[PDB]
DNA sequence: TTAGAGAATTGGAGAGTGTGTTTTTTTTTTTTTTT
DNA sequence: ACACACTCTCCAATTCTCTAA
């Protein structure tokens, strides 16, 4: 056989390398200021997510990363279990 | 106020001011990056003067222009025969006499593409000598392969010239004949110098490969060398 | 036959 | 066989010479044509070759033969023009039946050859083979017919009509009425022929104007000039206006609909109203060109392309990347964009209409067609007199036809009706917006109940069977009906018509429509947006409202709105105002903030608001920045109150009962 | 309204095949024989 | 025999459709 293809998958997201890093650091990473423009602060939010997206899965363009994440986010039940777990933690 | 674009700079002033004592060495060791940093600094300072002092001059005009630094008086002159492979990509100073100059050569800087079927057009940046042609036409409804094509006479070009510099007799070894080295010069400094002129120059000492044949990517082990001038005196 | 017009041709 | 084919071709050529020829005794250099004998049999046998052979075998080979031997250009036009000029001179003074017979039988062949072309999966392989070439030949026909003596053959055709206008309807035999249908059927074909559409077999993934044809020959502008000089517009205007008085409506009114469709098709109404001028706007456009040039310059390095050094960028966790180029040394934004741009992959992409010539439905209509000053004023005069004279009577007759015949319809007639309605209603609204001399009563037949029911029924039936082209066209028409209603309420029965227009069933349909638009072409989504704007505004000025607005607000509509908005580089200034009106409605008024916290919107505002995209001084930037400020303010508040939304921003919202309610609020 | 089971369309991995390659002045400085 | 240009083929990745809970 030819070599099988490599893909983004929910296992990567649920790994310690994956989504928990964002929730462990996002409160410290991003910082808005009224003292800078709407364009300035809007440009600031996407830095951390772009670098994180590259570190997670360097395959594809950034838009493709988001639009790929949409499918597995809607479909996979284990990922949805993790997400309801997050919002239950806030309900706690 | 005179509407001019180039600034001279004798490097010894970097040693006088305390904050730039180390920048002098970094200039000699890493010219390509440092000179670009200096250029973008000068342009920003020129904008800052008009906006801070709130003058009448057109901001768009200053934004349109390119500004360049031209360092000189870098240090001791170096003999033409004594340049060694450990001097590659460092700044150099030479003295000599001009033999001849070739006519101006057009050098491409920006490419222009046009779609054959839908007439969509794109301008593309040239870096490292390679044209980054698109894979498919980028119009959304005309996403087709092999669909763009180059239009030669709507590209943008720049001037290049080659000058032949000869060793002055003061340095020649005993019982030998003088040698020569080739200088590549661009834009402002193209047509400055004539046969028989005596000059001193300043530029990066470069080296590049050369192909074995025009058909294939096979390179030779020996490398060509030349000088890339940034100032003439 | 798989005939097809260039519907997207508008320049 | 090939020899049988060439035998028929040679038979057609010998018939193309038995027809007659000019006179060599004349000493007149050259004279006109001169007439043969057996010519009745020649024309009749040629008609038989079309009908009895080619149609029965479905070939178009016979048309290729007559095109080879150039019968139209060489014989038929001089025969008709000689008849016309002879009878014209006789009228100036103020067996002859046989001359008139030859005139009739020449015109019928002229209608037959220029008949427009249709291709399906049921057409023969012969016709599919011959489609591309007969298109070229019909283009030659259009040019030649409009050219001869500045188009004088068109005067013969209306004289044939005038013979049947002459005496009372009470006398007029069916064969008599067929002439009056035929003369308009001619003009429909002369307008309809236009440059070809390229078509190939999809076996492998890898212009048609002949050498004697050019655009200015074929443009609509030429047709306006040719029609005006040869006295056509008076004929159409007098025929349509007196249609009510006992011209048998059944024979005339559908072809007379097709004409009005066939040269309203490619006009924007703003081009007909102005709102050294050309040079002035050209200079302004050159300023815009300079701005684009400035944009390219701001990303251009000073020193040459081989001077460049190298750059290294270190992330958190001390990992390093590499990028080249001199501008990357200073601009981190450009470095970050350039880093991702090198990567190869793009996800491949999904794609709605076929079987109809080019129109508003499947082309970008931000591209005018261009008029001489005389042509502009003449065309304006024609359609203005048409509206002031003929519009209501024509629409009443054609609409009370179709209610009795809706089941039998074909897609052409539906799309024709729906794009005749829209054009004339919209044009009258704009003209009365401009000036007080015009009035809205000229187009008032559209509002009466039967036509409203019919447009509704077309939209209904088209949507149910998933026929999307008729759905698009019905969308456009229903938009114009709602706009006209909002005009008349700004001045009795109109409120009754509104209440019947907004029964709950129709609210279900009109709410359903934007959701499916996400998949389709750009024009479909734009139609959905404009219809939605009008629909919601009318129900705003009804004072029910809270029920209706909550019906609209949900994920798939927002998906369509963002998918449409990201192609802003192709769109108008006005559509973005409409989109941000809707976003204001969702975000501020309804306070359904949770919908828009999704990441692909945050990218779009960066792209659209940057120095890249929308102009620094266009009116759009006011709206965009004023929106983005409030958006990020509320987002700051939400994120600090509940840090879980950092992971929330990537994904759709979560529909679980117990956590979802607190998630949304 | 979600989701999962089955069918159809497309991409490009990668394997294969054929191909091309080495290789009469005219002007100007210098030595030599000839009248 | 050693880089190239071009052709051919198979296989699995992807989206679309139907069914039932
Ligand atoms: Zn294209």
Coordinates of C-alpha atoms in Angstrom, one line a residue, chain A residues 4-51:
Chain A
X4 CA -1.8 6.6 4.6
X5 CA -2.6 10.2 4.9
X6 CA -2.1 12.3 8.1
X7 CA -5.1 14.4 9.3
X8 CA -6.3 16.6 12.1
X9 CA -8.3 14.5 14.6
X10 CA -10.0 14.9 18.0
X11 CA -7.3 12.9 19.7
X12 CA -4.8 15.7 18.9
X13 CA -7.2 18.3 20.3
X14 CA -7.8 16.3 23.5
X15 CA -4.1 15.7 24.0
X16 CA -2.3 17.7 26.6
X17 CA -0.5 19.4 23.7
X18 CA -3.9 20.4 22.4
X19 CA -6.9 22.4 23.7
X20 CA -6.0 22.4 27.4
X21 CA -3.0 24.6 26.6
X22 CA -5.3 27.4 25.4
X23 CA -7.5 27.3 28.5
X24 CA -4.3 27.2 30.7
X25 CA -2.8 30.3 29.1
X26 CA -5.4 32.4 27.2
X27 CA -6.3 34.5 30.3
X28 CA -2.6 35.6 30.4
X29 CA -2.0 35.8 26.6
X30 CA -4.5 38.2 25.2
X31 CA -5.0 41.8 26.4
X32 CA -7.4 44.4 25.0
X33 CA -7.0 48.1 25.6
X34 CA -9.4 51.0 24.9
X35 CA -6.1 52.9 24.5
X36 CA -5.5 51.3 21.1
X37 CA -7.7 51.1 18.0
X38 CA -10.3 48.5 17.1
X39 CA -8.0 47.3 14.3
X40 CA -5.1 47.2 16.7
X41 CA -6.9 45.1 19.4
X42 CA -8.6 42.9 16.7
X43 CA -5.2 42.1 15.2
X44 CA -4.0 41.2 18.7
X45 CA -6.5 38.5 19.4
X46 CA -5.5 36.4 16.3
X47 CA -1.8 36.2 17.2
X48 CA -2.0 33.5 19.9
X49 CA -4.5 31.4 18.0
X50 CA -2.4 31.5 14.8
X51 CA 0.8 30.4 16.6

